[PDB]
Amino acid sequence: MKITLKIWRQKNRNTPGEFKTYVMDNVNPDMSFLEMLDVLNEDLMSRGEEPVAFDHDCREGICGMCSLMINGVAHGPKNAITTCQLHMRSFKDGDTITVEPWRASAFPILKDLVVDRSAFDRIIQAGGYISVSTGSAPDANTIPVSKVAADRAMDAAACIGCGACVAACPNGSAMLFTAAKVTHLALLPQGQPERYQRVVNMVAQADFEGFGNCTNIGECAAVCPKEISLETIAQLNRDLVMAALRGIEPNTPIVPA
Amino acid sequence: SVSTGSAPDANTIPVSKVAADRAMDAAACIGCGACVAACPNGSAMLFTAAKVTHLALLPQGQPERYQRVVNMVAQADFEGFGNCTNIGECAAVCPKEISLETIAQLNRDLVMAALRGIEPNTPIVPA
Amino acid sequence: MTGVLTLTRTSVGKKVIMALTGFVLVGFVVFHMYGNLKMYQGPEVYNAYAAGLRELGYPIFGHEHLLWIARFILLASVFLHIWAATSLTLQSRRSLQASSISTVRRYGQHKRQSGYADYTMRFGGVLIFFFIIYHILHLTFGVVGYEPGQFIHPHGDVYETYNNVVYGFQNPLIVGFYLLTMVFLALHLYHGVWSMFQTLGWNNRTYDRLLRGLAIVVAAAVFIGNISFPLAVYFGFVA
Amino acid sequence: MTGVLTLTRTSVGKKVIMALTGFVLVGFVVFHMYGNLKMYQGPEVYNAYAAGLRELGYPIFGHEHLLWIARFILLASVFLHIWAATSLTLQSRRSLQASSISTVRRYGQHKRQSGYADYTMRFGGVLIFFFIIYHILHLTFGVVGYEPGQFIHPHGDVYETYNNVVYGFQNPLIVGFYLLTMVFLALHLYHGVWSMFQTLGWNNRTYDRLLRGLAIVVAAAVFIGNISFPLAVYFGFVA
Amino acid sequence: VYRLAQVSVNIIDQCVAQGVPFAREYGGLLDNRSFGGAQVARTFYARGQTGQQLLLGAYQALSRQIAAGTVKMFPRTEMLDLVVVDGRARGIITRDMVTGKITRYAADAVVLATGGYGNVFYLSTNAKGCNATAIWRAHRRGAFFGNPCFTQIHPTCIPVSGEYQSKLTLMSESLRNDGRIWVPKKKGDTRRPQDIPESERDYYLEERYPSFGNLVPRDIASRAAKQVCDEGRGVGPGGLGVYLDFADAIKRLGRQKIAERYGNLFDMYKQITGEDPYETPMRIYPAVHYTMGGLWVDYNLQSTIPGLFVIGEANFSDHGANRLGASALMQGLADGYFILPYTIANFLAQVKPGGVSIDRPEFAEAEAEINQRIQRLLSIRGKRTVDSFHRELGKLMWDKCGMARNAAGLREALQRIPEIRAEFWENVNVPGEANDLNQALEKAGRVADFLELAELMCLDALHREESCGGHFREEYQTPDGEALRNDEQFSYVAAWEFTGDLAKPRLHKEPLVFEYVKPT
């Protein structure tokens, strides 16, 4: 396959970026998208140009490192997959593919396609956990969790933290990520003691970090690799309304280190 | 649906004496079918409602109660029993004096399960 | 996965549907008896009530808009009621058919201890269905049970409901049909007012007697008023 | 610690405020369309409706008391709606200013799979705000869009709302402005009727399609009625 | 091993308390499953991402501690050297991966939890960034490498579509319980695998090895697969792969139940390769998966350097010559939650806090060494890329120090590894600058450490004149192909000391005595 690539190239955070065009004479349909970027990087290194930098660790769709806006869609045209799980058989010969980072105020760009997604870490730090210390846990079968609640909480908990919901959201909102964590911890009994605080804190943190609001559009759910539903956002909304009825005040925001 | 070996300590979950007494009142069902015979509709509502009430009054029966009632009610339909006109001739002949509050509890459970969109599973076909 | 519409799947859910539609129909029957009690006030008050049923909320709602919403709700409720009643009667007949003395006898002896609510409820429901059809054709439309030149149809906002009622309960057969339907509707209410609470689960030991008393009160009130109307018209008290 | 007033602290809480005020405003818009449908009923019916809006519950409530309570509720709801919309729009703009290709492009390509609800909601909201101001100045007060001697202010209990409506949609520019606002209000309702349920958490898998259908029904009804009004007045159907 | 098995129960309690969404039964209680070859159902799982949920619970606890201010998190920061002051691990030298800044951190104790070195073979199931830099730098500073040659492979891995690929996706070995491994009899066949007739299929592992029928151990089957692919008979884009066919099982069993058993795997395979395994055979190839070698640690999880603690896959510890399934997550969570808190407190209670700052000459020497190494890597400007050298190294290590090892092959590898290292240091291309997001620089550093680690791995494999678990010597095997141990002479842990010469490390035997589980 002959593939034309329009890739965002940015030197660093301050330097303005642009689109550079790279022509791949031979692309294997079985070759993955990140593998094709690797071949392009090897070609650039042999030619003497600056290689394209992109985040990637697992190449399995589970770690959440890969974060590419491919042809206007987060993680490429094919849904329920990641950038690493996208292979070149999803494209055609002669196609032009535009490769971008995540565009969000809270997700700063550090390099050509690398994005700083530590705002998600700070959202998690603001209550996205169960405050249980090591050694104090009771027997693993002391509290029953219904198979339905466990399955729904595993559906929400399957969030690789890629930030593609923020990238595809027209508002640049972290609502799907936050709502997935809120729903995961709120469907289990162990997350009951601190759930109405947690949602508030988490929502406040997402505001503090610079994310937008939710217009209930659904692009976040459309591009989610793990098919995390908008029911998670409805659950977060129910939790926040219930916490407002209880007069739950957000804590101090998690400032960066 | 608890398997052998996985049960926690027997005093882990507190069951109030009132709830335990009511669940023992419902659980005292000898499965004679006299409710079906006395029922003008030939309905198994007293037996089914006794089991539903016994398992729904205990915490251990919470994780699968709204499914269970639906399934059980559907099975009673599939087996060929009639409906309940709230006549009460079931409770008049019951050897163990299972009350009609068990049927009211089953009705509450089924309404709550309908609100949750609980779909009955496939029926238990005879062997 | 379907939602509340899963109630159609079970017999208990069908009975819950019948309990809700019976709540609606009991409310309508009580309100209708109360409204028809205005015939003893005189032709003017009764006709004003009939006309104002159409002008309900006139400065805001159009003519007959609230009345047509009420009519649609009543029709949907009675249709769901009749469908569920037919399904459940058929289910219980199938439940009884296989093991029985004959097609009619179930047991060589069945001494009853908790009344005969099934027999009265089913036969009275069929009678009430027939009465509703004949009653809509009788008093609402005036196409049955009337001599030519006695029923006045409302053309404008002037209503002759009192005249139609007075000319309606002249045939002793029609009065007897209304009386029999009111007896079976009294039995229907006497069972069903308590039964709709028992079907939704809104019952226990402490409130069972209170709900039985409420059922008796509702049934007695509706029976007394609804048999007073045709008897008084036939005997000349209402003229 | 400040109670329900903690909703103002979060963007999700402000969105919940928008959902509640949008419940109120959707209800008012539907009721308004239903009331204005009385133009086709006639001038007498339309003016009676206009007068009975003010004389709502007269033997118990004073003149215009219920209408002024409704006006205050509408004003508070729309003010909270506009304030929260402004805050949320500013937040979402700041959420994209830093990392974007321009001030008008976020991505070199951003293909959309789930609708353009942000664009329509925000632009239609600004248009609806302008339309509300102009439409109050136009039909309620008659200080804009009227030739001299065409608008009749209320004189006691005699209302000429039909005359004001007839003389209002004569300029084709006003008709076009109303039609454009109704198009954007149709888009507003089509998204927002579903979105206000999703914002309060009153949504799931099984009722999502039902709420989308309810949103479509509400938006279509309001759009059809509210564009029929000025088109019919302009074309001479209403005169 | 007993301590790990004894704290596993606390591990599961802690994970369930942390909110890990383990599989539940309908009655609300936890659900267990069995691995392949285990006789009990002792495994607690999320649906197919147990490790994700375990790490999510641990990362949520870590985030709680970051919010509490007790933990300072430094992501995108690579530890490039270990600073040893007065014989104690008193700090580290790291490089920020975004700004390129070299930073010195001082601590009373250093814990190495840096994972395994399975990427010394280029083709492995590990993540792209997995490396041996931390444990190799600690080894050069004085930590002993315990059994480096002990490496585990995975049988069922999705092969590569070309020389560019370096990652083989792991597939549940259970795909081997219901499939048949075969290869076309013609060396070069243009026919579709489904169109190949039954008599023209070489069903190796069935024609050979009549024992262990359809249940061949992963090591024997994978050695056979590698031999077939090396003979030119393997299938796939590069010939590195064999046909795990499911056609006969689909015909025999119900396709619905086969879907219920392998639906996620088949969908993932169709996503990665583009071929439906319900009709065409699936293609698989062995890949290096785990390294149960690592820095030698004592019962206190402490290495040869006092104050340096190695936990998780980075240490040798208690997996022996073969790590059981679902035991590395167990071991990592045990070391983190219920062992290191005690042993590190035992170490710290016997020393005074503080007393070492980053202004010590040792920190400056380590930082100067790291800076010189980075400058040298950036200044070579050769004609070969970093991944070319890594691919050559991994090919040699997989051919010579992989599932099948012998004396002559290991001696050849021990001859070639220094040559590849010299060619790397003379002819590698590392573009970019030091103070930038230079991913080629990070890869260059990791491969520079791999080139030294591979020589030690080969020396350890040549040392151990026996087969045990993953370590398989062709000269010491049963006629069935199983590993043949020498418990009289090799019943020890080989901890290797860095002596300054990469070809001559010092061997330290740690004798093994078994009082409760007698060898057999």
Ligand code: HEM
């Ligand atoms: C004004 C009209 C009617 C009213 C107010 C009314 C009221 C009621 C009420 C409240 C119940 C109790 C529901 C429950 O037990 O949950 C009931 C039961 C019943 N009704 Fe009606 N009903 C009416 C008309 C009819 C009609 C027209 C039919 C049949 C064509 C009918 C047949 C039945 C039957 C068969 C039952 C009981 C079935 C069972 O319990 O298994 N009813 N009715």
Ligand code: HEM
């Ligand atoms: C003897 C007692 C009754 C009298 C005197 C009576 C009187 C009337 C009259 C005069 C009408 C015509 C007015 C109109 O259609 O709006 C009417 C309609 C009606 N009646 Fe009755 N009725 C009686 C019993 C009942 C009962 C027991 C029911 C039970 C369902 C019932 C249901 C209706 C219905 C549904 C209408 C039509 C309402 C409408 O079209 O708006 N009636 N009744």
Ligand code: HEM
């Ligand atoms: C005719 C009166 C109006 C009605 C019936 C109406 C209705 C609605 C409804 C139901 C929603 C959904 C709320 C939610 O998603 O929770 C909504 C959202 C919205 N409305 Fe309105 N609205 C009206 C006037 C306005 C005005 C005057 C503005 C001026 C800015 C506006 C701007 C918006 C915006 C911006 C949103 C979405 C907020 C976001 O982007 O997150 N609306 N509207």
Ligand code: HEM
């Ligand atoms: C073409 C369709 C419409 C027509 C024919 C119409 C007609 C009228 C008329 C004649 C009035 C003056 C009566 C009064 O002020 O009390 C009025 C007032 C009003 N209209 Fe509309 N309107 C239309 C669309 C809308 C829409 C879409 C809204 C949405 C918010 C709206 C909101 C109002 C409000 C708030 C008032 C003032 C109510 C009051 O002062 O009591 N109208 N409308």
Ligand SMILES: CCCCCCCCCCCCO[C@@H]1O[C@H](CO)[C@@H](O[C@H]2O[C@H](CO)[C@@H](O)[C@H](O)[C@H]2O)[C@H](O)[C@H]1O
């Ligand atoms: C027609 C009259 C009404 C409309 C005109 C007035 C519009 C006013 C809104 C313009 C923007 C100012 O709006 C103001 O937004 C800020 C931050 O954006 C919100 O600020 C608050 O919430 C945000 C996140 O949601 C956080 O910064 C913080 O929790 C708090 O400061 C205020 O609650 C709101 O008052």
Ligand code: SF4
């Ligand atoms: S919710 Fe989905 S898209 Fe958003 S971060 Fe999580 S996995 Fe990625």
Ligand code: SF4
């Ligand atoms: S009569 Fe009573 S004891 Fe016998 S089966 Fe029915 S409920 Fe059980």
Ligand code: F3S
């Ligand atoms: S697309 Fe954006 S507006 Fe909300 S529903 Fe998804 S985060």
Ligand code: F3S
């Ligand atoms: S008598 Fe029969 S109708 Fe119901 S309440 Fe008892 S099973």
Ligand code: FES
């Ligand atoms: S690289 Fe891990 S999700 Fe793609």
